[PDB]
Design an enzyme around this catalytic site. Sequence first.
Site, mmCIF file in Angstrom:
data_model
loop_
_atom_site.group_PDB
_atom_site.id
_atom_site.type_symbol
_atom_site.label_atom_id
_atom_site.label_comp_id
_atom_site.label_asym_id
_atom_site.label_seq_id
_atom_site.Cartn_x
_atom_site.Cartn_y
_atom_site.Cartn_z
ATOM 1 N N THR A 41 -11.755 -5.086 3.435
ATOM 2 C CA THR A 41 -10.851 -5.203 4.571
ATOM 3 C C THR A 41 -9.835 -6.305 4.311
ATOM 4 O OG1 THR A 41 -12.507 -4.392 6.144
ATOM 5 C CG2 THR A 41 -10.671 -5.690 7.032
ATOM 6 N N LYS A 60 -34.627 -9.396 -4.636
ATOM 7 C CA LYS A 60 -35.189 -10.569 -5.307
ATOM 8 C C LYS A 60 -36.673 -10.331 -5.587
ATOM 9 C CE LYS A 60 -31.250 -12.166 -3.486
ATOM 10 N NZ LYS A 60 -30.289 -11.309 -2.734
ATOM 11 N N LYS A 92 -21.634 2.120 4.191
ATOM 12 C CA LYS A 92 -22.446 0.914 4.073
ATOM 13 C C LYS A 92 -23.901 1.215 4.422
ATOM 14 C CE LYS A 92 -18.584 -1.448 3.426
ATOM 15 N NZ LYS A 92 -17.686 -0.253 3.332
ATOM 16 N N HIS A 128 -11.145 1.613 10.787
ATOM 17 C CA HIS A 128 -11.525 0.822 9.628
ATOM 18 C C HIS A 128 -10.366 0.866 8.634
ATOM 19 C CE1 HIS A 128 -13.915 -0.563 6.128
ATOM 20 N NE2 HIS A 128 -14.668 -1.141 7.047
ATOM 21 N N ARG A 151 0.827 -1.201 0.000
ATOM 22 C CA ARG A 151 0.000 0.000 0.000
ATOM 23 C C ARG A 151 0.863 1.253 0.000
ATOM 24 N NH1 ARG A 151 -3.805 3.381 -1.695
ATOM 25 N NH2 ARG A 151 -3.981 5.116 -0.204
HETATM 26 N N1 LIG Z 1 -15.256 2.325 -4.330
HETATM 27 C C1 LIG Z 1 -16.325 1.394 -4.099
HETATM 28 N N2 LIG Z 1 -17.325 1.259 -4.984
HETATM 29 C C2 LIG Z 1 -18.346 0.365 -4.770
HETATM 30 N N3 LIG Z 1 -18.407 -0.411 -3.688
HETATM 31 C C3 LIG Z 1 -17.464 -0.345 -2.761
HETATM 32 C C4 LIG Z 1 -16.349 0.585 -2.929
HETATM 33 N N4 LIG Z 1 -15.583 0.414 -1.849
HETATM 34 C C5 LIG Z 1 -16.132 -0.466 -1.142
HETATM 35 N N5 LIG Z 1 -17.214 -0.974 -1.556
HETATM 36 C C6 LIG Z 1 -17.991 -1.968 -0.932
HETATM 37 O O1 LIG Z 1 -17.537 -2.182 0.507
HETATM 38 C C7 LIG Z 1 -17.202 -3.629 0.552
HETATM 39 C C8 LIG Z 1 -16.031 -3.903 1.474
HETATM 40 O O2 LIG Z 1 -16.402 -3.415 2.788
HETATM 41 S S1 LIG Z 1 -15.369 -3.575 3.905
HETATM 42 O O3 LIG Z 1 -15.168 -5.033 4.286
HETATM 43 O O4 LIG Z 1 -15.887 -2.981 5.207
HETATM 44 N N6 LIG Z 1 -13.939 -2.885 3.477
HETATM 45 C C9 LIG Z 1 -13.941 -1.657 2.746
HETATM 46 O O5 LIG Z 1 -15.003 -1.125 2.432
HETATM 47 C C10 LIG Z 1 -12.638 -0.994 2.335
HETATM 48 C C11 LIG Z 1 -11.304 -1.344 2.761
HETATM 49 S S2 LIG Z 1 -10.312 -0.341 2.115
HETATM 50 C C12 LIG Z 1 -11.209 0.605 1.245
HETATM 51 C C13 LIG Z 1 -10.791 1.686 0.462
HETATM 52 N N7 LIG Z 1 -9.578 2.291 0.412
HETATM 53 C C14 LIG Z 1 -9.359 3.328 -0.369
HETATM 54 C C15 LIG Z 1 -8.120 4.089 -0.541
HETATM 55 C C16 LIG Z 1 -8.046 5.147 -1.422
HETATM 56 C C17 LIG Z 1 -9.142 5.534 -2.182
HETATM 57 O O6 LIG Z 1 -9.058 6.622 -3.084
HETATM 58 C C18 LIG Z 1 -10.367 4.819 -2.044
HETATM 59 C C19 LIG Z 1 -10.443 3.737 -1.152
HETATM 60 S S3 LIG Z 1 -11.748 2.585 -0.669
HETATM 61 N N8 LIG Z 1 -12.594 0.255 1.364
HETATM 62 C C20 LIG Z 1 -16.900 -4.015 -0.835
HETATM 63 O O7 LIG Z 1 -17.105 -5.433 -1.037
HETATM 64 C C21 LIG Z 1 -17.817 -3.231 -1.632
HETATM 65 O O8 LIG Z 1 -19.115 -3.910 -1.742
HETATM 66 MG MG LIG Z 2 -16.156 -5.921 6.612
#
Ligand SMILES: Nc1ncnc2c1ncn2[C@@H]1O[C@H](COS(=O)(=O)NC(=O)c2csc(-c3nc4ccc(O)cc4s3)n2)[C@@H](O)[C@H]1O
Ligand SMILES: [Mg+2]
Length: 538
Positions: free
Chosen positions: A341, A441, A527, A243, A216
Amino acid sequence: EDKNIVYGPEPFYPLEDGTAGEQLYKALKKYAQLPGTIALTDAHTEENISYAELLELTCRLAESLKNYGLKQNNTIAVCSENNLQFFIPVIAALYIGVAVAPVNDKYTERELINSLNISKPTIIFCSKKTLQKILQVKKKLSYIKKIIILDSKEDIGGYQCLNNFISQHSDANFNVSNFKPNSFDRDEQVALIMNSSGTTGLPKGVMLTHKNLVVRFSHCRDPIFGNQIIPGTAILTVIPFHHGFGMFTTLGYFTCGFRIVLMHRFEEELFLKSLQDYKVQSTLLVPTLMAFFAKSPLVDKYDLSNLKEIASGGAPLSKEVGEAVAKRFKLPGIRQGYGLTETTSAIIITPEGDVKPGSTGKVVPFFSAKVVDLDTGKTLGPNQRGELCFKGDMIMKGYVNNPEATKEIIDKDGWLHSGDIGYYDEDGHFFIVDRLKSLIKYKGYQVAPAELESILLQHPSIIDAGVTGIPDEDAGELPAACVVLQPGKHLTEKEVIDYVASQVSSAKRLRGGVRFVDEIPKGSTGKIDRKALRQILQ
Ligand SMILES: Nc1ncnc2c1ncn2[C@@H]1O[C@H](COS(=O)(=O)NC(=O)c2csc(-c3nc4ccc(O)cc4s3)n2)[C@@H](O)[C@H]1O
Ligand SMILES: [Mg+2]
């Protein structure tokens, strides 16, 4: 086969050697050598921690922790709202190979107990606000040997504060110049333990190694995939540090030498005033806030001419909202990242010079991605919706003491099934449609709430929206929507329903109706609480 797998490009420069703690130490030292450089700034209090101060405190805390007795692979936990001291124990622990277990400061005692039962930390760094609930849970947990208060300058009720702990376990006059962090196997040593329910089951502890973090760190400094602001620039983040979205964006910010302006609670006026007053050029938000930037008139009351890098993550972002933001701020486009995550940080990022409205970007260096058919499991080509799967160097080591769940999300070959539906165009731009569990659904149909939400957000009178399915004996789930209206504007249920119907196929219509609300139930990282939406729509 191979032709349908999408691979990230080579990093602009090779991966830097060393552990996450070593790279963080070198960065703090480096910027600490420039006068007046500030690392952290609390927007609410306007207090600041310079890079020199942060280096002193992280090195002195690492020494205090070593003198206390912590060894490599021990575990600590951090339970605190976003503040200036949050990252002191995180960085100090990474210096000596101690694993860090951030825990949501808003957790109920039951949630707190389960998370601590997974990480089993020896020391919990808390805040004044979370001190009491930690004291309550600790009564039941034998493994907790020490509680340190991060944002108090005096001890409270027999529990020690950070300054007094450091003073007790480290000699004053300690030369910071001579402090060196430990060198260990970054591929094997866990750096952080994050909480995530993954795709099925209860909350689990995600193990992320130092290797994942240095990857990262490569990303965030890459001229193509990294932040597009120069060292010393001010960046404002509203994402919670506990987070991974906040944790791995902010930790990278230290390696870039940015002035990190933080808030422990989003307030529209303080947010905009902080952006103007600190001449912020980059901001990290969630889709709801992107809509705020696109539609709120309050944006015109502040000088935001310095803002040019507007990033969104955590949840699907409406194409039109992004375009509206870029247009209003006269920018070529917006920034976005997509991750879980279990992938440490974002694995799909909008690269420099390559924007595509609606797309969250392209696969980051060191990663590969594929789209698999939800039925046959086979790989798919461009513009085919399927389950997004990933593979690369930021994938977690696994869930703590849970090999089964790890094998349930990471298949036999090394592909992580994200559980999200999306596709990629012919240029390699990925598009996230929505989470599979979120799909409504309706009879034999599966409607994506993000699609209807994007439609609702195209309306000038709607500032927020949440869509889910309501129970129905014959159809199963009827699509329905909660809508937050622009102050001073009004819309009827029929207006919203007809507005959506004129743009979507019959199966996607809002047959469950529309309820207007003051806010959309959403988590701290975007979320949408579908369950709360159903309760409201009942
Ligand atoms: N950009 C996105 N577009 C659409 N959906 C998105 C999304 N990010 C997460 N999600 C959703 O959150 C879910 C995951 O949830 S989670 O387990 O709590 N973990 C996360 O949501 C998670 C971990 S890291 C992270 C990011 N880091 C970044 C660093 C720089 C930057 O410019 C943008 C981002 S987003 N998001 C995904 O499966 C997805 O469904
Ligand atoms: Mg999660």
